[PDB]
Write a protein that binds this ligand. Structure first.
Ligand SMILES: */C(=C(/C#N)C(=O)N1CCC[C@@H](n2nc(-c3ccc(Oc4ccccc4)cc3F)c3c(N)ncnc32)C1)C(C)(C)N1CCN(C2COC2)CC1
Length: 268
């Protein structure tokens, strides 16, 4: 039909995985052989014309630390987005689960995994726009991968897209996004910094004592996240470097990967 198009007849819905961001998610089999997860893009939530075209570029993205996109179902409604099944679910839950007693080595490995994915997205000039622990997925092997990337681009409800919106990710946003709606590679850098904080805080909510509007106010005025207990000074420096007020002074994802690998070597 199209190169990435999947025939819905090749799919079979088996289990409920819950409601995800921008759609219902189900576990199933593709061609009765491969384990897949299917996100059904809620009808009318997206600007379908633009969304279908941008999905083609999205599908061409290929990386080990990006959630593997098998195909799409764009000829019917709701639109399906078919991906690999990530058995350990969302990273936020994986972090919060108290039966998991993490070592900092494992927490730094999670940061590397995402930083590799984000370095790749940066090399393709493809912005995530909503990087967080709730968005990241974990497979059966404990490898973290990035997911829902670029998916906020064409959400029709202004409460999700507007910097002053009620469902906007204020706590993962830099001052230039909150004040001026200015997204770039450096807004992804800021968010990754907050994600590092989330990881090292074992899934704690950033700026938890403040509401979203209170947080928005305090970020613009110079508030930055404190050092988590599990974060060493060197790890804190890395996540803190992501939060320069001036966007151009923030590092690239290449530089952040180099910083993480340096710490990894000394950490051993
Ligand atoms: C996280 C959940 C928990 N516990 C959690 O695990 N998940 C929420 C339910 C759906 C789960 N899930 N989603 C996918 C999946 C993601 C993305 C896509 O499509 C795209 C689109 C663009 C680029 C890449 C991928 C398809 C999918 F199928 C899963 C996969 N692949 N495997 C396994 N599980 C998947 C994720 C938390 C943070 C606790 N949770 C709380 C409730 N939240 C809803 C309330 O508002 C949202 C969801 C987030």
């Amino acid at each position: 039909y199209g190169s990435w198009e999947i025939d819905p007849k090749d799919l079979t819905f088996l289990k409920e995985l819950g409601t995800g961001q921008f759609g219902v998610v189900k576990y199933g089999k593709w061609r009765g052989q491969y384990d897949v997860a299917i996100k059904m893009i809620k009808e009318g939530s997206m600007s379908e014309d633009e969304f279908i075209e941008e999905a083609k570029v999205m599908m061409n993205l290929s990386h080990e630390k990006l959630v593997q996109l098998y195909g799409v179902c764009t000829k019917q409604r709701p639109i399906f987005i078919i991906t690999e099944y990530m058995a350990n679910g969302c990273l936020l839950n994986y972090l919060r689960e108290m039966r998991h007693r993490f070592q900092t080595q494992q927490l730094l490995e999670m940061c590397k995994d995402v930083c590799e994915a984000m370095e790749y997205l940066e090399s393709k000039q493809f912005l995530h726009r909503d990087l967080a622990a709730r968005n990241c997925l974990v497979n059966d092997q404990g490898v973290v991968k990035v997911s829902d990337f670029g998916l906020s681009r064409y959400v029709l409800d202004d409460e999700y897209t507007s910097s002053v919106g009620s469902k906007f990710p204020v706590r993962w946003s830099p001052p230039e996004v909150l004040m001026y709606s200015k997204f770039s590679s450096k807004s992804d850098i800021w968010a990754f910094g907050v994600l590092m904080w989330e990881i090292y805080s074992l899934g704690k909510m950033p700026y938890e004592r403040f509401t979203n509007s209170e947080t928005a106010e305090h970020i613009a005025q110079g508030l930055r996240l404190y050092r988590p207990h599990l974060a060493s000074e060197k790890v804190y420096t890395i996540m803190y470097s992501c939060w320069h007020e001036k966007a151009d002074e923030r590092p690239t994802f290449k530089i952040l990967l180099s910083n993480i690998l340096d710490v990894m070597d000394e950490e051993s």
